[PDB]
Nucleic acid binder design. Sequence first.
RNA 1: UUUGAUUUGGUGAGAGG
DNA 2: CCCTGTCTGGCGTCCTCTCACCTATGATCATGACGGT
DNA 3: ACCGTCATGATCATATTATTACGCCAGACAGGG
Lengths: 288, 251, 66, 1340
Amino acid sequence: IETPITANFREGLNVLQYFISTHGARKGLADTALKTANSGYLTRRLVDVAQDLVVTEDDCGTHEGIMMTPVIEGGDVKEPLRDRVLGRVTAEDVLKPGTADILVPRNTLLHEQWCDLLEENSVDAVKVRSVVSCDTDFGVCAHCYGRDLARGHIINKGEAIGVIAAQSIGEPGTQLTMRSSIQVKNKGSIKLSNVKSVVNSSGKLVITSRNTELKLIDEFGRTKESYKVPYGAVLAKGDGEQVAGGETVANWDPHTMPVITEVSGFVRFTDMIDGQTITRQTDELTGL
Amino acid sequence: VPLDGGRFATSDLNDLYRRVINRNNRLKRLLDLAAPDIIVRNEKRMLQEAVDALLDNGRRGRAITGSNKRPLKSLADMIKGKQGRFRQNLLGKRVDYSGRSVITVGPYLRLHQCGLPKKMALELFKPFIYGKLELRGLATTIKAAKKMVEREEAVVWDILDEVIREHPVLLNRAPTLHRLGIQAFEPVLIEGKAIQLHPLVCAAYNADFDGDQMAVHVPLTLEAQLEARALMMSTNNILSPANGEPIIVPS
Amino acid sequence: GITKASLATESFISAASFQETTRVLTEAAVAGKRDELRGLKENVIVGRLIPAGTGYAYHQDRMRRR
Amino acid sequence: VYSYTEKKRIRKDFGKRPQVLDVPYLLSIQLDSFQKFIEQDPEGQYGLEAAFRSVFPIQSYSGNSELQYVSYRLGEPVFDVQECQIRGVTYSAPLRVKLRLVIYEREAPEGTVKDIKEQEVYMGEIPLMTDNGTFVINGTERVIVSQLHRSPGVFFDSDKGKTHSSGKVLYNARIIPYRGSWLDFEFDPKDNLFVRIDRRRKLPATIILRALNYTTEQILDLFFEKVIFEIRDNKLQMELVPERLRGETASFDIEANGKVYVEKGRRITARHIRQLEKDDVKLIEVPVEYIAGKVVAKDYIDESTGELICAANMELSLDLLAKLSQSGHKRIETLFTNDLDHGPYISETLRVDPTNDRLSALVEIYRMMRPGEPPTREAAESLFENLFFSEDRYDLSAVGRMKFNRSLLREEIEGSGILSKDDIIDVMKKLIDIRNGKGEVDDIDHLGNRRIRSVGEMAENQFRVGLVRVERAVKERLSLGDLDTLMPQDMINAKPISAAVKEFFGSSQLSQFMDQNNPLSEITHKRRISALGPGGLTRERAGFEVRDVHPTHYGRVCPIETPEGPNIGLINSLSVYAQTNEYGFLETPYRKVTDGVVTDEIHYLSAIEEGNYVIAQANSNLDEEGHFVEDLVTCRSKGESSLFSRDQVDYMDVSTQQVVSVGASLIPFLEHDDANRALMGANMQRQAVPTLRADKPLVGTGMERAVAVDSGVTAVAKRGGVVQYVDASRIVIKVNEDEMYPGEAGIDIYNLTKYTRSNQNTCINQMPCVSLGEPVERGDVLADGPSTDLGELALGQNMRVAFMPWNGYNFEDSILVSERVVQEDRFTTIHIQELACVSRDTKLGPEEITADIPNVGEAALSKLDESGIVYIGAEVTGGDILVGKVTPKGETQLTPEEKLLRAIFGEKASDVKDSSLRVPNGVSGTVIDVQVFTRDGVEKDKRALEIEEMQLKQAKKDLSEELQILEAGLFSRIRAVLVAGGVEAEKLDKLPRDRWLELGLTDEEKQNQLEQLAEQYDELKHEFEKKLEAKRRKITQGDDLAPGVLKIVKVYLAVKRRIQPGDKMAGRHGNKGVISKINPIEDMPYDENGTPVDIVLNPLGVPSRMNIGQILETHLGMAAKGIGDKINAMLKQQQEVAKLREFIQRAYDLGADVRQKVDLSTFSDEEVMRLAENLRKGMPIATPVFDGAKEAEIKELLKLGDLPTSGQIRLYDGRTGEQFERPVTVGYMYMLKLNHLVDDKMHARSTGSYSLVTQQPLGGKAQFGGQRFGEMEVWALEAYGAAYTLQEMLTVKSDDVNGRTKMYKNIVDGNHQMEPGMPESFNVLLKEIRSLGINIELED
RNA sequence: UUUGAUUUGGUGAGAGG
DNA sequence: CCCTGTCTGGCGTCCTCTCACCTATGATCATGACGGT
DNA sequence: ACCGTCATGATCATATTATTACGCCAGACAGGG
Ligand SMILES: [Zn+2]
């Protein structure tokens, strides 16, 4: 509503302002009193899909597990690696970021002391054991689950993890709601992934691949920023380069899909006939 | 069973079975009498629809009804639904040795103990008090003990403080969402009629004190007392199982 | 999906305590299905020890002594 | 000037806006609707006359008989309200109807009937309404609640977005009749037009246009324009109006008059349209490709062959043009089917149609209604004339015809109740216009489309359904009997009418049990706009938008008073000034702001008349004439608030209290509370309980007197005068002579209602509040009710509160209360429980109520009399015997000698077992009232004869005192008349007083008046004779009762519940709380005067739960008590009235331009002392809702008392005796005790009874039951490793019967051990699955 | 060849958390 | 024959507390009150 | 005051019709390019 409620509660609200306030608050009470049914039915579906899964071994005997990286949406690094790899047992032994060192062994639980020795060495990402990669028939082994979470140690042989997991996902169901180009922020080094590129005539490295990931790696080794750069964008920078904080490093036009080339030469109209294939629309306000 | 009065409040299945038997008797009599084809086709069709209405009512076209327009409840409707046997009597049951009252604060408590009223304590612990009274030798038969606690003499409160002492109880707030909503305490007896609940523990139950109610349950057997002390005690739940964050945070 | 996955289980009491009981009981009846209990809600239905918590030693013992 | 009870305690009033329309009578919806229902109403409608003239005359199945209608009449009820609530009857009135039977002859139904008969007939019993606005159905006072539903008429909704998953919106046009078959026109993604009738199968829409006898040529004449092609010598020229060409790209070069107008490849601009219409171009030239797809309108036939050239609604090709060109046709009529302007929806619809004439359309409609049966032309005509076009089965109301004409832009709002052809064609025209892009759709939640039914209209509809069942019965009987020998009471029977109206008032979804524990709760349950019930939506299905406040609830439906939980916004409460329109919509007052001046005339606007005009906000500043003092003023135009100029306004609101309801206008400082906390405050103010001595609100809104007087708990004076006799039972008013009838001499007697049971087990008392010899005015309180005081409304009590954290005992929301509160007996509420005991009739004989009872001794029977019933006054405990009743013996041991009765003793030797029916415990009390009802024929025992003699004696004394008191008033009238005209000063009292008529006086008005008083006196004599005989008949007779019951004993216990840790108290802003510790007096924080504070709240609830109004209420309450303490100081020192007059005048002026303006110079030195006697416990202050007391006025009133300006006193501690740092806030808050007590929720069970079908414990508290260890608790114990706890929690403690008896033996022997077994309810699951064709087992 | 106290069902409406 | 609207079934939160309200009938032997002798 | 006639209450099988106004969301089905 274009006219706000300029009066607080210490000054008096008049009539219209309180009525607009009642719009805004009746919507919230209706949302909670109808949201709670979906939250409870979500907890029910979750504890009946889980319902069976019991910690029933001590090691499945595998070497597979998901690759825990810190998550980065495009702003500053949102959830650090110490939040994701706290108390989860590594899959293979993490190499120290210098060269080929056995920093941690390959079946160690990562409690707070190990995670601090991970944060000192600025470890990139940890290949850690996940429950979906567990090889145990009819249950989850004790290492592929992780830390007990309300006990400091590993999960005991027996403790029902499906039900506590289903409750822990569905329990915050009440608090949840129901109803141009790239500008860098920090100052570091450039790295490109999924890139197949070419240098244009002016010098800005344009990209012949749609799915290119533009990472900003710091001077330490960890990945601090990530972005998605489209097919055919004007990169102000290049691979492995050092930039300044706030300098624009990418540019494109999304309303005009570029059909840029790899080589040079002359242009011919192959199967382009005016009258059937293409049409003649001379511009009104420009003339070109 | 009859309700309070002189008539029998009959179940719906008796209507269903009584109709199937009425129709089956009619069909046997018509096959005795050699009625023509269309009569016994309607008779067997009414029996088919009667059996199909008995088993799963309303899966066929519009369900039959006795009183008044509401359809009557069949066997499959004794199984299925929110109020069948699974979701209403086998997964969740009503429970003896249990109680319920309004909560209040009582901040003098240590966080392994909760306040529990004397009237609820003498009602929930009637068999332990009976066993204690029969051990001392104050009475003889069970009747005498039930008269003693029906009168509430001066000697059963010492018996009650000697059955409480190291015996945990399960406090439970009514919308239990995660496992920290059932926690086991040790009772401390309360002159009053309200459960005194230690304040830090409230942030686990999502329990404010604006009119809330909680249920108490008594672990009867010995393995259940040990599970209440060793797994479900309130000192043992100081970290939320969803993460690593402490749940006994000062509110 | 979670409701299609909990109704497609090898234990028809687990898939009957949940949503529609008509479909699951006819599928289990005409298949002649059998429920080697082996989970939490079958043992909450049938009235015995949970095979997770304290009862996991009891179910180790019973599974060993067959 | 002020009324005499307004000179008792005149409430201080802040407030700035001078009112112009006072609060109306708050119960006008119920009373006005039911007065509209039952009243002798001529000119047909509304009322019962509408039903009796729409279902009658019943004419027979061609037997030439007819049962027509004359009139109706309701006799008096046999039972008045008090006897009806005591005994348990309906409060009904018999409905006598005068019906007439006429019987026509042969060969002339337009001929003379041979015989008529007109007579009185009995049908049904409709329950009357009491003066409070409530019904008494079976001794329990019930309220029928107004329903909010959809307005009958057309409704053009748009199924937006969701269908077909391609964004193409649909448009449907639901015609909503008031009674009959629905009708939904709609579209489909192929842009066809589909009708449907009552949500049945779908047909193309034009099939009904053929059913109204339209040929296809006429249909295309209606729904399209025409395009004319003239074959004139060159390329089949065209008549062209260029308005159709607005933006169309032509296929050639349009030239005319030898001039190129339009080029090929371009479109026709608007200026080219101007050129062609300025030059008046008519005939243009088309190519052969232009009429390649033009759709012909009507049929062309060739004159030679007699065949069809081209059918109607067909595109034209080359060969069709070649055929019609050589047949002699020069004019070609086609249609204009554009992309944006006019789609060919009718044309595609007629191309999907298989039907071709009227008969096939009627056959297809008869076939979609009743599937699979042979149609016949007579049956199809009869069905389609009885769907929409008959007075019987289809009826829009006047509301329906108004909406149907208004939403189609008609002029006359009057029409027939049935549809016609033009109506359906206008619906299809408006639907096609909405699809074309002009015009708008209609929203649902807009209150111009939500009608309000009430008690009268719903009772009329249920009575009409009863009448159509009885017209089925009368049509059955009338032409299947011998005539003339019967009368019209042998035909019509009263069973379906009484069954229908008794089922509606008895158990409906809207005839609900009155929440009666408070005058506020009565007067806000009667004003309720429920959306649920029959014809409306349901809670567990819908929805989102209907639970939201629309912009046109402003001043009709309250935005902040609604129940939170599963139905928010469906159980809306109607506002204060909101009336109901003539049709049923909502309307609200406004003030007609003519061009400069706010004129003080009120003017009621509906919900759609409000939108067109522009309404000024309620609190806009104006300078003594009406001229708006600003030049930008905040207004709202069309559902949207904005800022408008000074003199473009058309209306102003009346008073600033009109957005809110009466539940949430007793909240002081409402504009400072956030709306959630105001909602919770209004709902808990409804949930209060009446205390023992209700005090007053120190900080009210002035709305208390409307809620108290305009409800029915106080004893309002009817005619003013002088009080003659006050008593705790009765009050006698002597009526003043300038208010008094000439005859029926008249002094009124108010019989108050002493201690009796309410519905919520409170104690509805009435206390007399007037002195003796005191004048009272017409319209004035005499007896305060429950939670009233001097005619005000005192729900809870006002106590000294401090906001400080005090050692944790008020942690989340808790409240900490001194023992000074419980010592003063000030929350000690009084509850009354009714305990019934019936004497049924079983086998081996009837029961015994006598006190010769087995298995009991002296200690039980000392509290009973010699006939079983407990005394009146015996203070009992929990588990004594109230009524002794013996029969329980069952069949412990089958009688050896079959039925050996006459052998040992008289009847039997106590069967086999005996146990006098002894009751439970948990509650104390004092037996205040015992009722004994006896089914007639049964021997009355000695106590039933004692109660009969008692009530005979009471009614005898009461009617004799009626005669004596009215005779005393009559003799006082005779003395008042004989002051002049033959006065005898000494001779008047020498003779006996009954002869004051034959004294010396001529034929004047005085001897005429003495003759009229002799007529009145002899009428009172014979009336007293016949009424005492009838009252002896009513006491002496039996009562009709249940099948097979001897006598019913009802006993009223009267518990007095004080306060304890665990009760719920709350203020009036949402500050809830369980009281957590009842401290001693010494521990309370006191101040540097000495007084302890009573209640210590918690400050931390204020910044999060944003209810900042309670702190302003606290400061203004402390100001009020400061003025009260200064009055108490100036009066305790025995000071003369001059200083009291000075100080009271200074405390009543004190403000800005306000409304009160009192002066004590016209109170005359005796009222000022009594006004100060009423002000010494504090000075009451009114603070209206949105025009309240600002901060500076509270500061100036805290400066009048010698209190600190900031409101905060420094407070010492009680324990340490040393000062709290940073001085704390004290004041008075008006706090309410709620009836969620703690000795009604607390429950405990070791081992009780067990259910029958599944061997699990019972549920509830009255049934001694156990708490449900639900499913999520089972999940929470699976989530730990607790396995044995869950095994005993669902096998031993709950279900397995041998397991739990082994458990009970093992617990009382000290061996904690369980033998598990199986749940018996799992065996019930095996039997229910096994009772199907399924074979479930248990292997191994 | 004689020991026993035992059982209160659906439907719909409303409130608390 | 592979997309496709269209129709039919199947979900929709736990725990608790208070109150009221509960199918019609169509046919007949035998008991029960009323009037004549 | 006894005998006969009208009236009125027990027990007992007989077996189903004249409203609409949720919102997805899978899952199966006849239609047609
Ligand atoms: Zn594993």
